[PDB]
Amino acid sequence: DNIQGITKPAIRRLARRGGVKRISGLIYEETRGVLKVFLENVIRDAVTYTEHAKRKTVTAMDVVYALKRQGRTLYGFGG
Amino acid sequence: DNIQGITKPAIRRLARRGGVKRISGLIYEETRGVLKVFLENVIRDAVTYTEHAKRKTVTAMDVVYALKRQGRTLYGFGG
Amino acid sequence: RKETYSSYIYKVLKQTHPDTGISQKSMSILNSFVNDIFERIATEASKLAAYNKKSTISAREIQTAVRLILPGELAKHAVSEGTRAVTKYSSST
Amino acid sequence: AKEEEEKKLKEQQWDKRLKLNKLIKRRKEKLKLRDEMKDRKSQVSQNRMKNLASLAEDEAFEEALEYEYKDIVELERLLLEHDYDWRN
Amino acid sequence: PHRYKPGTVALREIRRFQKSTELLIRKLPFQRLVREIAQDFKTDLRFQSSAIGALQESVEAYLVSLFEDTNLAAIHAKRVTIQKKDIKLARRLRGER
Amino acid sequence: PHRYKPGTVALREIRRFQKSTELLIRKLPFQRLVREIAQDFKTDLRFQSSAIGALQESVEAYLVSLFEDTNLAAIHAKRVTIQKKDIKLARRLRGER
Amino acid sequence: KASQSRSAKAGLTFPVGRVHRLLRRGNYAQRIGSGAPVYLTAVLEYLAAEILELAGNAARDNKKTRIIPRHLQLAIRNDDELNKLLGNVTIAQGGVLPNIHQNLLPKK
Amino acid sequence: AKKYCDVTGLKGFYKSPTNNIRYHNAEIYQLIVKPMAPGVDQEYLKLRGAN
DNA sequence: TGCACAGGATGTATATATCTGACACGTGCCTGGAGACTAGGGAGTAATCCCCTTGGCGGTTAAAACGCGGGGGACAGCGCGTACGTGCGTTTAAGCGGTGCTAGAGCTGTCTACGACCAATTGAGCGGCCTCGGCACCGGGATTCTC
DNA sequence: GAGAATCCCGGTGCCGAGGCCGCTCAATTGGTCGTAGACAGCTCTAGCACCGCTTAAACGCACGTACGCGCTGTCCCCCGCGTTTTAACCGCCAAGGGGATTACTCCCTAGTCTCCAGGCACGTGTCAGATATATACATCCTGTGCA
């Protein structure tokens, strides 16, 4: 239970943060697949940055550069 | 009258390039509305490029450079 | 040794709001913001200076870069503030 | 339309001029304030947006109103008479 | 007295223009348009010939890219005909405001 | 007793979650998910908590943007309920295929 | 003989020589002019002042004395040019704006 | 040196703080001095050589 | 059978006393920015040439503008049923928090071999010029959807 | 079954795509030196694992009512088409204005030595929140008695 480790009201919480009204039952595994296919592109770049750095731990800067790659840059943990 | 330079059968030519059977007659004025803006956004970033070169003619090299700044690096005319 | 823009940012909000505290997370947000504008302006200026076959970066290159990157209203405020500051700096006579 | 006719009849039955001129000047100031609120870079529209954000944290109509104010000023001038130059 | 059904010759000329790849906009009115939008910022502007063709290729490509998306939006809207909300829905979903 | 209209306490919960800024995904299933998906590319991999946090805020922000785009595409489609074809349309017109 | 820095020579509170150092060993060009760090220092100082002004009245609109990234996020996305500048960036702990489409309300 | 208005050549009483242009009265400031484009003020200051 | 009155209980109301609780200010230090002195080569000015591109013809001709009949499509409207929300009972396994251990980040030292710099050289890739066949264009018969 | 409307097979300049030689800079070879990545070696932060109590959130079964969806009937506005008509485009001549380039100048920015205070890093004090006493007064509720 790792792919469905995100519980059923959690996609609901992200949905009402997105301002929807009525939610269907078949969206949940599709949003799980979209989540895993975004995560697959993100952490592949993150671990390539990790094995370039001669390290076997993924710390704070090689992830923020990894999201800086595709134009989805996040602030705050750039140091 | 010069703003009517793009013509309605040329919009039909672009519309039958996209592969649509039926084109409503109010699309033609909408398609002009999305055109005079967009090429404008390259004229904001071409001629000032030209203005940095002490240059009073725009050429083939600064326009594709402006498109590469915008995000549509184009091939065919150098650069 | 590590470098931050914390004191300069501090005095910047102290001219405008004296009775105002700051969060460390907000300071990191602001530091990442100013560093991002810095690297954007620097790569625009270096790219423009390479495009004009010139080996020198001067004030007019970042002037064109600020005209290019920033939207127009904030662009002419930015170049106005920069021109008064540069003309004040150049009066060392 | 009968109501309109009755209103016109009542109108026909019907320092104060200086007060009306001051009201016309206040209407011109209201038009200036509407123009300041229309320009978002102005401090009046910035203060209105700050009030809207504080509530969140808690132009043709202006031209028509200016035309109505000009009509009221013309009616006041006609009542005073009956009952912006290039040179400057 | 041979009358075609509406839309068959549309699909046929759609097929020929899918075969075709030439420019679909008239060149000289486009030159007039770019000169009249360019005179607003510095008068007495000279223009090279290749830059106008690059501009025409750019606007034609952007028309194709936006028009495919509004076609998909109108197909998704259970209709055969495009409308204004299809256009601003495509511009909203592409992120072009 | 007294009940509520279905669709009114939903608005109260929407405004409660939109004024809120707290994180809406549990930390330990998310850390198990990112470790199990990082095991596929490189073994014996350790992690830092701020990296997990950055990953978490990135994914919920992308999910919120996708949900807002799906809501807009669904209310374009003369309906209230979102379905998977609006998700597919939003991803297709957003660029990510 | 002793004189102060270039920053108060230009009347700025941001470090001019540090900007010059970051420009020179940032590897952007082999020759860097004299007036460029002053211009860049003025531009970044003005942008920081405008951002902190917006965060200032955003925090006065919440009746507080400290700056939370809620206030930064709000002061970013209620202003249109910072919306255009910072469209693709995500802020840490920011949330979203209160918005609801017109037909979704109980219109009756 | 005497001070004159940069727009009309009349007697300049006031100087705008933004672009440093001497002007004559209020409506000159509203119509010309305030909404002028950048790059024009340097050419106005070129006549007396103040740039 | 109801209403009014009296009595009791509970809540309120606004300085204390404590009393933490997370904030803002008074001293070290060290290193990097600033002043002084030398060099050389990079904008900078300018003049000259020649190339392309802005106007001006004219003819003619695809091609846009315009009005016209008819036919599916989008429009609102109404009914059928079920899927989503609402709810209480029942898990359960997130969260705090606490502790124990050790990989591994991170810093310092030293080294020598990869790479910057410089001078001479030879050759190869740019260009001007020359020559011809692939493809578009035109003409006319086979062939496939549409009605 | 017919008819536009194609795909297909063959004859025609052409003009823009392949050689070719002349040759001029740019890649190649060699040498010297000063430092920067590699490796070894070291000190402690911090990440992994596990136990246990608390409980708030989550799963599941139940049902009820809008809302998605199926059908329908109709204005009507895009669509195919004949007729004018209007400007787009090809061939061309001529100017001149602006880009490329050559060429010498001089200043100002790269580089190096010195040296002291800017801003970091790490200590100590001061107004905001939270339980607590507290006594008297006022309001509300409940019980009892009376008509």
Author numbering:
A (entry chain B), B (entry chain F): 25 to 103
C (entry chain H): 36 to 128
D (entry chain R): 439 to 452, 463 to 506, 547 to 571, 584 to 588
E (entry chain E), F (entry chain A): 38 to 134
G (entry chain G): 13 to 120
H (entry chain S): 112 to 162
From the paper:
However, amongst these remodelers, the INO80 chromatin remodeler appears largely sufficient to generate the well positioned +1 and −1 nucleosomes. S.c INO80 is a multi-subunit complex consisting of 15 subunits that are divided into three different modules. The catalytic module with the Ino80 (ATPase) RecA lobes and insert, Arp5, Ies6, Ies2, Rvb1 and Rvb2, constitutes the core unit of INO80 (C-module). INO80 slides nucleosomes with 40 bp of flanking DNA ~100-fold slower than nucleosomes with 80 bp of flanking DNA, displaying a switch like response to flanking DNA length.
To test whether the reorientation of the Arp8 module was dependent on the species of histones used, we performed biochemical and structural studies of INO80 on nucleosomes containing S.c histones assembled on the 601-nucleosome positioning sequence (S.c nucleosomes) with either 80 or 40 bp of flanking DNA. We found that the remodeling rates of nucleosomes containing all S.c histones were within 2-fold of remodeling rates containing S.c H2A, H2B, H3 and X.l H4. Therefore, for all experiments except those in Fig. S6, we used X.l H4 instead of S.c H4 to make S.c nucleosomes as generating large amounts of X.l H4 is technically feasible. Two distinct classes were identified in this dataset for 0/40 S.c nucleosomes, with the grappler region of Arp5 adopting either a crossed or parallel conformation. Our structures with 0/40 nucleosomes suggest that the Arp8 module sequesters the HSA away from flanking DNA thereby inhibiting its ability to bind flanking DNA.
